[PDB]
Amino acid sequence: QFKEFLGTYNKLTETCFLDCVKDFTTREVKPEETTCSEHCLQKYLKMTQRISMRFQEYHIQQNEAL
Amino acid sequence: SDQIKQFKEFLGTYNKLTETCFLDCVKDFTTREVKPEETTCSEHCLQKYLKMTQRISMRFQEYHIQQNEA
Amino acid sequence: IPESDQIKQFKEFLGTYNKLTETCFLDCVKDFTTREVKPEETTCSEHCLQKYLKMTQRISMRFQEYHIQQNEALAAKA
Amino acid sequence: QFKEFLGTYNKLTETCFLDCVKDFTTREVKPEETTCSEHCLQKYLKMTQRISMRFQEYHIQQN
Amino acid sequence: QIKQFKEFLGTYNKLTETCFLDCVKDFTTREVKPEETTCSEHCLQKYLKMTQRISMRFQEYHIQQN
Amino acid sequence: RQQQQQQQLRNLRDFLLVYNRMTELCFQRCVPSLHHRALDAEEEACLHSCAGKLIHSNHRLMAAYVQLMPALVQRRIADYEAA
Amino acid sequence: DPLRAQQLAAELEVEMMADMYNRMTSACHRKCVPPHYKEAELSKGESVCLDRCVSKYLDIHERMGKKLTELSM
Amino acid sequence: PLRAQQLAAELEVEMMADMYNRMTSACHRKCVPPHYKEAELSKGESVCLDRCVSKYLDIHERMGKKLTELSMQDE
Amino acid sequence: PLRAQQLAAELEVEMMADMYNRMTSACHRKCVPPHYKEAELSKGESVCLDRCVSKYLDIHERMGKKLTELSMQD
Amino acid sequence: AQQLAAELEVEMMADMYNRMTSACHRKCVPPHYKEAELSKGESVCLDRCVSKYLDIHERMGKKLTELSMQDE
Amino acid sequence: AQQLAAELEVEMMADMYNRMTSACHRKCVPPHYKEAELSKGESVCLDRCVSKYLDIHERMGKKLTELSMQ
Amino acid sequence: AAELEVEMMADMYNRMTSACHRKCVPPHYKEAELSKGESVCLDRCVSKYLDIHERMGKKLTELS
Amino acid sequence: PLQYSLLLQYLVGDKRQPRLLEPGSLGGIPSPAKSEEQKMIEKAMESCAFKAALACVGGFVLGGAFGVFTAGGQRGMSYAKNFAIVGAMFSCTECLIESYRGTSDWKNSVISGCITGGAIGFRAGLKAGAIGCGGFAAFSAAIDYYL
Amino acid sequence: VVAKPGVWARLGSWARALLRDYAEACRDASAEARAPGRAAVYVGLLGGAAACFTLAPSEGAFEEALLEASGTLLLLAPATRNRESEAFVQRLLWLRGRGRLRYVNLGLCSLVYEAPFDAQASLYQARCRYLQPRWTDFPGRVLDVGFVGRWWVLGAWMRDCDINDDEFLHLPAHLRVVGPQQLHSETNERLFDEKYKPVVLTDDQVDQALWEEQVLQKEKKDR
Amino acid sequence: TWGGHWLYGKHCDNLLRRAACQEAQVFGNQLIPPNAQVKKATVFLNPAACKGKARTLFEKNAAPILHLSGMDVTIVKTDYEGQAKKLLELMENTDVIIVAGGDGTLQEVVTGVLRRTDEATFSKIPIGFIPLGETSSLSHTLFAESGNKVQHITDATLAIVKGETVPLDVLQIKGEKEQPVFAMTGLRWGSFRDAGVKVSKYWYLGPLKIKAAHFFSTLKEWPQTHQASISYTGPVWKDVQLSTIELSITTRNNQLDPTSKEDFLNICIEPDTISKGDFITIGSRKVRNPKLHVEGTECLQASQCTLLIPESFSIDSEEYEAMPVEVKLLPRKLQFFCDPRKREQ
Numbered sequence A: 001q002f003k004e005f006l007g008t009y010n011k012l013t014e015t016c017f018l019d020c021v022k023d024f025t026t027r028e029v030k031p032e033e034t035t036c037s038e039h040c041l042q043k044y045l046k047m048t049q050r051i052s053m054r055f056q057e058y059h060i061q062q063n064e065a066l
Numbered sequence B: 001s002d003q004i005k006q007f008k009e010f011l012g013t014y015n016k017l018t019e020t021c022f023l024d025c026v027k028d029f030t031t032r033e034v035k036p037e038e039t040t041c042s043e044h045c046l047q048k049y050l051k052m053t054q055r056i057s058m059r060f061q062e063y064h065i066q067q068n069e070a
Numbered sequence C: 001i002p003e004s005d006q007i008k009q010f011k012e013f014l015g016t017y018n019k020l021t022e023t024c025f026l027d028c029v030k031d032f033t034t035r036e037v038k039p040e041e042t043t044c045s046e047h048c049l050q051k052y053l054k055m056t057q058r059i060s061m062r063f064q065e066y067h068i069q070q071n072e073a074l075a076a077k078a
Numbered sequence D: 001q002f003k004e005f006l007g008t009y010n011k012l013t014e015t016c017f018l019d020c021v022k023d024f025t026t027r028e029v030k031p032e033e034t035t036c037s038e039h040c041l042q043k044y045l046k047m048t049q050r051i052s053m054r055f056q057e058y059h060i061q062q063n
Numbered sequence E: 001q002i003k004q005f006k007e008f009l010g011t012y013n014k015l016t017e018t019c020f021l022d023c024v025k026d027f028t029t030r031e032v033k034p035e036e037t038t039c040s041e042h043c044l045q046k047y048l049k050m051t052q053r054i055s056m057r058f059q060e061y062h063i064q065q066n
Numbered sequence F: 001r002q003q004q005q006q007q008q009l010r011n012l013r014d015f016l017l018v019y020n021r022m023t024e025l026c027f028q029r030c031v032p033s034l035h036h037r038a039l040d041a042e043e044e045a046c047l048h049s050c051a052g053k054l055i056h057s058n059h060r061l062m063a064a065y066v067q068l069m070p071a072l073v074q075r076r077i078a079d080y081e082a083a
Numbered sequence G: 001d002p003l004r005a006q007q008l009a010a011e012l013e014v015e016m017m018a019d020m021y022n023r024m025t026s027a028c029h030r031k032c033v034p035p036h037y038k039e040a041e042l043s044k045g046e047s048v049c050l051d052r053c054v055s056k057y058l059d060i061h062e063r064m065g066k067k068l069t070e071l072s073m
Numbered sequence H: 001p002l003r004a005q006q007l008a009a010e011l012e013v014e015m016m017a018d019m020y021n022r023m024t025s026a027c028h029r030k031c032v033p034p035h036y037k038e039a040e041l042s043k044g045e046s047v048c049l050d051r052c053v054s055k056y057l058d059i060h061e062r063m064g065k066k067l068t069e070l071s072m073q074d075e
Numbered sequence I: 001p002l003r004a005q006q007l008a009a010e011l012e013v014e015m016m017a018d019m020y021n022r023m024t025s026a027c028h029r030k031c032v033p034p035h036y037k038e039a040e041l042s043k044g045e046s047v048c049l050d051r052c053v054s055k056y057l058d059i060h061e062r063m064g065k066k067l068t069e070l071s072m073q074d
Numbered sequence J: 001a002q003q004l005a006a007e008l009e010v011e012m013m014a015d016m017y018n019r020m021t022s023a024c025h026r027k028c029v030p031p032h033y034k035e036a037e038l039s040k041g042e043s044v045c046l047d048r049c050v051s052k053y054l055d056i057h058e059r060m061g062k063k064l065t066e067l068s069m070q071d072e
Numbered sequence K: 001a002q003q004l005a006a007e008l009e010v011e012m013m014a015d016m017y018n019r020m021t022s023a024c025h026r027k028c029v030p031p032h033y034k035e036a037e038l039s040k041g042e043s044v045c046l047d048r049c050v051s052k053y054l055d056i057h058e059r060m061g062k063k064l065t066e067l068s069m070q
Numbered sequence L: 001a002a003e004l005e006v007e008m009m010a011d012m013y014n015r016m017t018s019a020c021h022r023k024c025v026p027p028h029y030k031e032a033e034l035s036k037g038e039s040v041c042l043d044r045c046v047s048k049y050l051d052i053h054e055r056m057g058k059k060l061t062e063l064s
Numbered sequence M: 001p002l003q004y005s006l007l008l009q010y011l012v013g014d015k016r017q018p019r020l021l022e023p024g025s026l027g028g029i030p031s032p033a034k035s036e037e038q039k040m041i042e043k044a045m046e047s048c049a050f051k052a053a054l055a056c057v058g059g060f061v062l063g064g065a066f067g068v069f070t071a072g073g074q075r076g077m078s079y080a081k082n083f084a085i086v087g088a089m090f091s092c093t094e095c096l097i098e099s100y101r102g103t104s105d106w107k108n109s110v111i112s113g114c115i116t117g118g119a120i121g122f123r124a125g126l127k128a129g130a131i132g133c134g135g136f137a138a139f140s141a142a143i144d145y146y147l
Numbered sequence N: 001v002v003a004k005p006g007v008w009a010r011l012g013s014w015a016r017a018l019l020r021d022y023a024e025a026c027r028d029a030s031a032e033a034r035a036p037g038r039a040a041v042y043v044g045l046l047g048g049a050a051a052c053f054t055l056a057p058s059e060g061a062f063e064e065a066l067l068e069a070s071g072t073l074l075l076l077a078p079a080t081r082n083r084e085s086e087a088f089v090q091r092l093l094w095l096r097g098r099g100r101l102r103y104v105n106l107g108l109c110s111l112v113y114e115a116p117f118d119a120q121a122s123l124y125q126a127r128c129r130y131l132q133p134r135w136t137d138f139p140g141r142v143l144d145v146g147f148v149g150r151w152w153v154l155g156a157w158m159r160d161c162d163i164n165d166d167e168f169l170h171l172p173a174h175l176r177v178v179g180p181q182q183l184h185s186e187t188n189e190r191l192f193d194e195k196y197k198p199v200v201l202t203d204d205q206v207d208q209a210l211w212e213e214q215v216l217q218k219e220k221k222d223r
Numbered sequence O: 001t002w003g004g005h006w007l008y009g010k011h012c013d014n015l016l017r018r019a020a021c022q023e024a025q026v027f028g029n030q031l032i033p034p035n036a037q038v039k040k041a042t043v044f045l046n047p048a049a050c051k052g053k054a055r056t057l058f059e060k061n062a063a064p065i066l067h068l069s070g071m072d073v074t075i076v077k078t079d080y081e082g083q084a085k086k087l088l089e090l091m092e093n094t095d096v097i098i099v100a101g102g103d104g105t106l107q108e109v110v111t112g113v114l115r116r117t118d119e120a121t122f123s124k125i126p127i128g129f130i131p132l133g134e135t136s137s138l139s140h141t142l143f144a145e146s147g148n149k150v151q152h153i154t155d156a157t158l159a160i161v162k163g164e165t166v167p168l169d170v171l172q173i174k175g176e177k178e179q180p181v182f183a184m185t186g187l188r189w190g191s192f193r194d195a196g197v198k199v200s201k202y203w204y205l206g207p208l209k210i211k212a213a214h215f216f217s218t219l220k221e222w223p224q225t226h227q228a229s230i231s232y233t234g235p236v237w238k239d240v241q242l243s244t245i246e247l248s249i250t251t252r253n254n255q256l257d258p259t260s261k262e263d264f265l266n267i268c269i270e271p272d273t274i275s276k277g278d279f280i281t282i283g284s285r286k287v288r289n290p291k292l293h294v295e296g297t298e299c300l301q302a303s304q305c306t307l308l309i310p311e312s313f314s315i316d317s318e319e320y321e322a323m324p325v326e327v328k329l330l331p332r333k334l335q336f337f338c339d340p341r342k343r344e345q
């Protein structure tokens, strides 16, 4: 669990950074970067939630067909 | 004598298979020969029905034993 | 003992008699507006009967032909 | 001696799936995607076999 | 020991692939060309400088942080 | 006694036959789609209805049949006597 | 000899009568108590057919008896 | 007496066989199509059969009970 | 395998009777609609049976072969 | 023994979960990141990616255990 | 067994470190290799990479712990 | 230690596998088996990969 | 040990031996004992060659009576032979159609009627059959309700 | 014998006349070909015959299609099943449990309508000619039609069974469009792969001047 | 232009049939226990009642509505009249009775019923009426006035299902020798009766028969007057001898529906001065509306009377041999079925 949590937390920083940084002349980030950081998070999380839901559904189904 | 009645049940279900697969997938009453496109149904229907019956019996015994313990 | 050999035939005749009455009744009778049996609803029954009998006859004839043919083939395989 | 096998299983599933199916219009796989899966399985297996052979071809000269 | 060897081996087998596919393009013969040997040398030096730089900056951050 | 035992045994037999037939029929026409593995209200209502209706039907038919049959068996034995 | 055989015939008659009762139930139900399944009590048109089907089935079970006693004399 | 219980058990067994031979045929016409293009049970069937059986027996017991009580209140 | 052949005789007569009944019912279901205007069988309904019997016995033998095959593969 | 098989299975399930996540994110979700909520078409594409991937996974596992004794 | 969690955490910190190294390498270390001389613009782009990645890392840790407790 | 080197070599093999997969064959998958133009893929991939691996371990042990 | 793979062979298999059965040992109603010389008689009576000949002679007599009625000769003979020809064609046609489809339904009659009408029209003129089909089809359709 | 030979000669003359008529018909067909309308007529007739040949039979086709769509719907979870489709199919299957379903095969089509009672019913409440449904209401009691091949309604309601638009109402209007470009996964792959691109450097001089001034500021603060 | 109206009428009649059958269905889908018993019925039908065009009319327009209403409806067919009388004498117990036809078969049935030697309980059996005849006398005081030909009969037979009831009075007239004879509306004796009788004989011309029956009956002789004596009584036995063209002894027509105090017969003695001219024009109307009287006639109220005629009259459109008779009223002796709207009145 904790491992899953930290792993997704590390993956998500990576993806969101790699996704929403297109200015590399400066030292500091503009608020748009914060807007991304806040949107990427919730979106990725809803995504992972739906995926886990469908996976658990399939799992109990396959466990119900023995 | 028990094995004998077992084989009798076997023959009974075999007649049942015959009739069922027949009624289900034998339609064109034009020629006197088994159409090649429906003599494969038979082959399928046979094992389909066998597996169906096995699954049914499995669930039936599972349920009856779930009851017997309680 | 030898009565059983014919008892079974008689009992099967009764069984098919009931099993056939049921069918002729299901197919012919369609008018429950009178406790009396209309004329159509009994000639239809007689026809159901005679047709079933003539069908069974043809069935047995063809089956016996098939069986003797297959048995001749088997005996010739020897 | 068995974990690597399931690793290859997962990896080749990922490869075949990612490289053929691109419609997502219907929930059920089309026959074309079944052909994809078959061909991808066969090709990846032949590739792995050849990889193993050419890799033992390194140990024959290294040992 | 091993607490510091894993990272070295990882660097090694990562630079292997990260440089094997930058300049090794022509596939007709069974031997490397000097354009690939010097290429790999530059890969080595540049990647090592890059990694040591990244580590130095990470430590600099951690210092300026606490 | 053994005669009465055989008779009550036969009665139990046809009773259970009716029970089986009733199960089969009420399930064949009060359970169209099985998507949930569990029985819901409307289907339980269909069951209550089918069962009560069928039992009442059977009572009525037994009454009428026991009214009539004696005449028919009497006709049967009379024709046999004539033969 | 014919006494014992006549007895067995009466036994078979009882069995036939039970079989016919069961088939009558089946048919007179399938034929005039159709599936609406909203009330457990019988309606009126039904309670009438249920009384007619019997007298209309027993006439056939007898006509057919005469006919088959003729043919399979 | 012994023969009585023997025959009672035999008859219960025969009735169980009847119910089995009715349940198989009822679930067949409700889960299995006549398609028979395949030759082995798919998922849809292997599920619908379990679900038909987990319902037919429920009905069986429910009707047994309601029927015995209805026949008792009748008389 | 001799007592086997005796048992075979017995089960053979029995199963043949059963199959005769099944075939009667099935050929009735398929080759004879419920009209019953006249007694004499129509022309088509007199050949449809000669076609049902054979299409049924061939089925029977095919199932027998396939079933022996599956059984030996226990 | 049993514990080893359990660890094997749970590990090979976590791996496929991660991989299916990566994929269905590769294929359905676009990288725009302007509204912190999913659309409908993509919330469908996700379910369909999962179903298809699982079907393929079972199918390939079967067709590959086939080639476990047939390759002997 | 909390020190076990702590060494897990430092392992995850190391994995994040390597991930970000690879990320910035792909981001602003073009695939030319014509000169092993690490360029100045890239020399500072690396600083920017690390700084921004760590800023986002801590912001996400904060916001996500807030989400979880929520 | 040496077993760690063994699993290291295993990971390196697993790595080169995908390293050459894309280089050799495109994502067409129209045919269910290798052509000849690609039958020379791997005897070249692995050869050059191992050459580079060794010549790189050389420069790595250099500083060691 | 029953060895199901072997009892099946003895029951259904080339290893089976000949069997001597009785007609009545199986089946509800024992088929009445029948002479082995009448079954071919019925086969001939039902075979639609006989029915086609019946239609031939019936249409012959019909055309004869029609020519007898219309005059009040020679035209009667032509009408008789023509009616006989068309009837012998129609009967055998519908018989073959039925024996093919196996079912007795109005489709057979309408098809045979359209066939005869189109054939006659084409013998006279192709454009004529295109309407003789529909004409005789409606005729043989209404004949069923008159039947 | 001479009379029989004469009759045979007359039959031969009639056969010759029939052959001449056939030749005239062939010439007329050639003239029609010289003048393509006849080709269009032949094409229309071939299409009609093809439709009649591959027409949808209820007994097998409808049973199979219904009993297969039911299976498809079983697997899905109650959270993802288009309510209307499930209801329509439960309807069609609650009738078929009874005998309410009827079927008819035309020459180019085939329908499936429902009756208010089964076919074995011999009541008078069902047989009365003055309670049966009116002619004009037949189309109002038809369910599924097979035009040429398979059934053209079952599929239509079974096309989007998985999607459930009930819980997608927490959204503005411009999130409900599900046009197909959003499912064919070709562009998304490109956009995802084009996330790691070597970034260009153009302002190195001014950027480094800013970094230098920044370290000078840091130095000033240290003092 | 002409056939279209015919088709439209057929359509509307089918519509009405369908609607009434729906209502009857509503009355038939009603629950009942199994031990309970159903309300039986017995139908007497004279096929040759209107013109022989009754069998079909009844089988079409009312039989359904009897079969849907949930009642064991046994149908009988009266070949001739004595058949009906004997049958009804040997009839068993039931719950209702129904009669399809003109007042003739109705009178025959009421005779067979109340003549029943041993039953004053049949007078409790609610009978029903169905006017298959072109014209009826009761229908005016028992049903809706009229719509089409079929709406009347439909509503009438539907009132039976409705399960209403109405007490009605009859009158018994005794032949000194012949068995008694009962009737609901009344008897008539004289010229107008002969006219109404002979109109059928003059079937060659439809327009003139409605008047020429009377016309030609005049050309035999105008003074078709006949005399007889009566001894009547009030609701003490005073006699009156008199000669007329026609005499009608009938029941009331208005106060049968509402409540009042008196229970009295109604009589109508006719003068004999009318001219042939006024005779034709008035008989032509009377044959279609026998309720009215010619003019200024005498209609005194009574309860019981007796007729002494010097050496053939009709009772509710049924011919009978004339003789001296004793006539008496039975008040509210029978129970019929009325539309509920009329019951409200």
Ligand SMILES: CCCCCCCC/C=C\CCCCCCCC(=O)O[C@H](COC(=O)CCCCCCC/C=C/CCCCCCCC)COP(=O)(O)OCCN
Binding pocket: N102, N104, N115, N116, N132, N133, N134, N135, N136, N138
């Ligand atoms: C525009 C005004 C002019 C009118 C012209 C006539 C048009 C006719 C169109 C059809 C009318 C609909 C009525 C159909 C018949 C109703 C009869 C009925 O009751 O239905 C079935 C009979 O079944 C049928 O045969 C159905 C009728 C199918 C009609 C087929 C005609 C084909 C015409 C297709 C029209 C499409 C229009 C498109 C034009 C295309 C041209 C390029 C009864 O079955 P039962 O066994 O009684 O079961 C009920 C138990 N309670």
